[PDB]
Amino acid sequence: TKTTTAPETDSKRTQLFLQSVSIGQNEIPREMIVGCTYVEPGELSGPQLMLMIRDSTAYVVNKLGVKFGTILTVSLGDPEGHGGILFSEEFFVLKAPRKDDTVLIYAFSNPVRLLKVPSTSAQYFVDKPPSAVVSSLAPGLKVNADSFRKTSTYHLNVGEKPTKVLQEIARDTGSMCWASRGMINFKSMEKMANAAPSLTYESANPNTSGFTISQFNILNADYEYQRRHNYRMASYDMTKGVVYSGNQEDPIKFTSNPDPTALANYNKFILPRLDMLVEGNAALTPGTTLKIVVHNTAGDGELDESIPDKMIVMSVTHFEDRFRFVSRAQLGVVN
Template sequence: MSNQSAMFAQSLKINGNDIDVNRIVSLAYTEYLDLSGPTIILQVRDEQSFIVDNYGLVAGTEIEIGMGDVHGIGDALFTETFTTMLYPVKNGVITIEAFQKDCYSIKTPASRSQFFTDKSPSEIISALIPGLKIQSSVNGKGVYHLNQGKTPARLLRDMARDFAAACWICRGTVYFKLLSEIVATPAALTLGLNSKTCDVDIQRFNKINNSALFERVAYKNFSSWDTELGHQRSGVCQDKPLVVVAYPLTPVQLANQCVYIQPMLDVVVVGDTNFTPGINVGLDVIKLSHDAEIDESVPATLFIHSVTHYAQEMKYNNRMILGALNV
C-alpha cells in the first residue's frame, strides 16, 4: 500500500499523555460491517521504553487517536478511543493491537443476566452500548436473553442474523440496518480498473472466490420449536441437513439464518476517509485485451464489507473487502 500524500493520524494520546505523531511508524485502522471492530494496529517508536515505563502502557490502556486526511481526498475528521489488547516490542518499536473501546466492552462476558422481552433492536442496543448514537431501520421486536458469561456482541450478532440485518459500530454510531436496504442504496461512486470513466482507480485487485466455504456453513434446513405453534421450519434449503435452533423463531427468522454477506473482491485504492462500511460502490473492470472488454465476472455493484485505512509516514491508502448479498 503506497503512493499517497498525507499523514492520516492527526493526534495520539496514550493514557491521556500526548505522543508526537512523528513517532508513528504505521497505522492500520479497520472498520467492519459487523462487530469484528473497529480495530487498530499501531506501530510507535519507543527506543528508550519511555511510553511503556513512564506512561504505563499495559493491556487495557486507553489510546485516543485523531484521524483524518486533511490534505487529501476525504474531508472526514474524527477521534476514536481504543482499548489495548497486545503491545509487543521489537527493535524499539511497539506494535499495539486494540479494539475501539465500545466494541471491546461488548466482547467482555456479562457478569449478570439481562432479559429483553418484546424489545426493538434500538432498545436492546441502547441498553448494551450506552453512550453511542443509534441508527436503526428495523422496527420489529423480539425476545433475547443475555445470560451470564455470554458476550453482548454475541447477542447482537444473533439478533442481526434473525432480522437479516447488519450491526456495526462506526465513528460514534451503532448501525442496525437490513442487508436488503444496504444493497438497494445507489452506488456512491465507481471504482475502476483500466477504466477511463471511473471516479477512483483501483491500484490492486483480487477476486476472493471462496463462496463454497460460506455456503457450507450457512445453507442449512433451520427449524425451531414453538410452545404454541409447534415445530417451525424455514421453508428454504429443505434438502440440507436439519438444524434445530435452541430458541423459538418465526419461519421468516429461520429463513434469515441462511442470509449472509459473501466477500467478492479485495481491492486497494487511494486513501479516502469517507470510505466506510455499508457504502455501495459501482465497479468498472476492463480486461487488458485488444478489444478492452468489460470483465462480466465482476458484479456491477458491491458494498464495502470492511475497509482498512493504512498509513505509513506520509503514505495513505485504503484496502477494502467488497461483498454482495448471497440471495
C-alpha cells in the same frame, strides 16, 4: 472530574492519515510513530488499531507507563486527500511488548471494549422491543436502525459477552451490524440490494472522472460460503407441533426458536466477490455501495462481465507507513 480543554497552538503540522496521538493532555511526538494500521470490520468485532513506535531511549513504556488500561486519544482524518473527513476516537490498550528498541501497541475501541466485557451477573429481557435491549446494553452509542418489526425475549448468561445478544438480534431481524465513528448500525439486507451507488471505481481507464484501482483479486468460490447456509430449518413449538421453513429439497437442521419471522431470516448473508487495493481513500466505510467498471489490458479492450456493476463494502483496512497511505477493501453481494 474531567475538564474539556481547547487544542494547543503548538501543533502546526498536517499529516496524511494519522494526525496526532495523545495520552491525556500530553502528546507523543508524531515523528516517532513509524507504523499505523486501522481496521473497520463488517460485523461486531469492533474497530481495531495497532501502532509501532520507535523507542530507543526507553521512554514510552518506562516513563509514560503504557500497559493494560491506558486510554489514547487519536485524531484520524484526511482533510486534503481523496476524502476530506476528520474525526476523533478513544482507544483502550490491551498489551504492548517491546522489542529491538521498538514498541508495538495493540488497542481496541473503548465504546466497543465496554461491549466485549464478560457479564458478572445475568440479565434477561422478557417481552421487550429490540430498541430497549440495544439502548440498555450499549448506552453510549447512537442507534441507526430501520429493520425492527416485532418484540421477543432475549437472555444473557453469566460469562457471556453482550455482543452475542446483539448478533442474535441482527440474525433474527435480518440486518448487518457494525459500530464505527460513534454510531451503532442496523441496516436491512433486502433494502440494501436496491441502493444507488455513491462512488465510481475504474480500472484500465486513464480518462476516468472517478478514482482508480491498482490491484484487485477475483474470487470465484461462491460454494465455500453457501455450503454452511444450505439447510432447511425446523423447530418445536408446544402449540403448533413441528415448524418448518426454507427450501424443500435440502437437508433438515434443528434450532430452538419457533418463530416464523426469525426462522425465515436465518439464512441471509452477504457473499464476498472481490478484494481491491486503492490509493488511500478515507471515505470508505462498511455499508457503502460502489460502481465498478473493469477493462481488460490486452486483446481488444473487452469489459469483464464476471464482476457485477454494484457492490457493497464489507471490510476496510487503512494503512500508513512513513511514506505512503494505502487502503484495502473487501466487496460483496447480497444473496
